[PDB]
């Protein structure tokens, strides 16, 4: 009785009533409850994971001989979680000079991959020359048999995305099932960077090819970084690719799709500053990603909105 | 439980002895092709058909009545009549009953419909 309701735990007139347990009965537990055991939820935090590497790990496997031999050259290149500020010109000079002296293929290529990664972080454009000078001959040209070491490919790809470069499309294509079959070994961050670059450059077709492979190779869709999905989708103006992207959008999860919308509305919105290159206007893809989000969320009832104009009829 | 286009092509080239593909298309006027290894029980007859003895069923439809263990795949234009037929086959208790939605339309590229039903509701 009142506008303030009784709280059923603290009130003995609830607790001890006939619909609950009186204090003179024997007070044991009624039934056991196993909730967590029967059907358990997987852990997904609202906050992203604080320790994760957040980059493209380039996997440095060197024989612990050349690793010691080449140390004064390698000390200038990135080691794990450490990014020395050495100017990229110098590093490339060192590779060009000293590398023909080393005899190992595997070593020369690990070293090269480090150089590429280093040049990806500084966004120096003259590093593809290195690909055409050493690797192109035995990997990409005229159906050469040789199969490049994975780390090298990851590194070059990462470089083509960081420095936006038409070249990526040629490399990526070699990684599908009939080629090197490297695509299932890519990191989630790899996909993230790829999508973002392709999106900036604006290839709907690059975007489609990449989303198809990602899906087939079972990438982690929900953990692909939202910004990069948005920038990729934003690039899609062509009727067919557009169709593809609706049908595809159904592959994300409820949550992912909600934040695809949030992120999208921010990047053309308040957070338009957050990007190094501003987005381009897609009103169509924006509207659609919002629409999709609305379709996939639970629906709420707002009767004064729906039935605002309802009039009954006696027909 | 569903059966997709992939399963359908596979079963065209590589049939299983005790899997039956049963065509539910109702009107003979609309059916010009034959789904490979299929048999014809039109939807309209199903409730009766499934209550025949093995012999009687043989006499009425001219092929052996599937046992209740065997796989039964159902077929129609859109996948609607095949569904309703499925409910019939499931109510007599048949253990494996699969409907192939989009069935004859997807197979042959025909656009036909089992029933004329439209998505739009007439305003109340």
């Amino acid at each position: 009785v009142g506008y303030t309701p009784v709280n059923p735990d603290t009130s003995p007139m609830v607790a001890y009533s006939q619909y609950h347990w009186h204090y003179n009965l024997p007070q044991g537990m009624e039934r056991p409850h196993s909730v967590n055991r029967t059907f358990a939820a997987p852990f997904q935090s609202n906050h992203s994971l604080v320790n994760k590497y957040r980059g493209v790990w380039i996997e440095f496997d060197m024989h612990p001989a050349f690793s010691v031999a080449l140390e004064p050259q390698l000390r200038k290149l990135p080691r794990g979680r450490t990014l020395p500020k050495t100017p990229a010109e110098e590093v490339i000079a060192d590779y060009t000079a000293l590398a023909p002296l080393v005899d190992d293929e595997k070593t020369r290529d690990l070293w090269l991959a480090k150089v590429f990664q280093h040049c990806a972080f500084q966004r120096c454009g003259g590093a593809m020359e290195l690909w055409e000078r050493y690797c192109h001959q035995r990997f990409t040209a005229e159906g050469a048999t040789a199969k490049p070491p994975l780390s090298l490919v990851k590194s070059v790809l990462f470089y083509c995305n960081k420095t936006d470069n038409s070249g990526w499309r040629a490399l990526f294509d070699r990684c599908l099932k009939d080629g090197w079959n490297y695509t299932p070994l890519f990191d989630t961050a790899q996909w993230s960077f790829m999508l973002k670059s392709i999106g900036r450059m604006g290839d709907e077709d690059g975007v489609r090819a990449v989303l198809e492979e990602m899906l087939d190779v079972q990438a982690d869709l929900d953990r692909v970084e939202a910004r990069s999905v948005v920038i990729a989708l934003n690039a899609v103006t062509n009727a067919d690719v557009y169709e593809f992207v609706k049908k595809y959008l159904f592959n994300f999860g409820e949550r992912k799709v909600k934040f695809l919308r949030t992120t999208y509305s921010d990047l053309r919105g308040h957070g338009a500053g957050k990007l190094r290159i501003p987005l381009k206007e897609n009103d169509n893809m924006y509207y659609h990603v919002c629409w999709h989000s609305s379709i996939r969320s639970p629906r709420q009832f707002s009767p004064r909105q729906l039935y605002f104009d309802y009039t009954p009829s006696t027909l | 439980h569903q059966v997709y286009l992939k399963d359908m092509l596979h079963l065209m080239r590589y049939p299983e002895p005790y899997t039956h593909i049963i065509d539910c298309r109702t009107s003979t006027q609309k059916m010009h092709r034959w789904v490979p290894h299929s048999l014809w029980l039109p939807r309209d007859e199903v409730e009766y058909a499934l209550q025949l003895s093995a012999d009687e069923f043989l006499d009425m439809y001219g092929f052996r009545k599937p046992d209740k263990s065997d796989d039964v795949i159902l077929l129609s234009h859109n996948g609607i009549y095949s569904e309703q037929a499925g409910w019939e086959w499931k109510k007599q208790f048949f253990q494996h009953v699969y409907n192939y939605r989009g069935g004859t339309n997807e197979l042959f590229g025909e656009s036909y419909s089992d029933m004329n039903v439209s998505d739009v509701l007439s305003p109340w």
């Binding site: 169709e243 609706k246 049908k247 379709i295 | 286009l5 359908m8 092509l9 065209m12 080239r13 092709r33 789904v35 490979p36 997807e106 197979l107 042959f108 590229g109 656009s111 998505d119």
Partner: peptide, 21 residues
């Protein structure tokens, strides 16, 4: 709101197979 996307074209899936055979 349906249909969300354009339905698959009329393509005939049985013909190519039985033609190969």
């Amino acid at each position: 709101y349906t249909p969300i996307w354009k339905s698959d074209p009329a393509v005939d899936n049985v013909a190519p197979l039985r033609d190969e055979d």
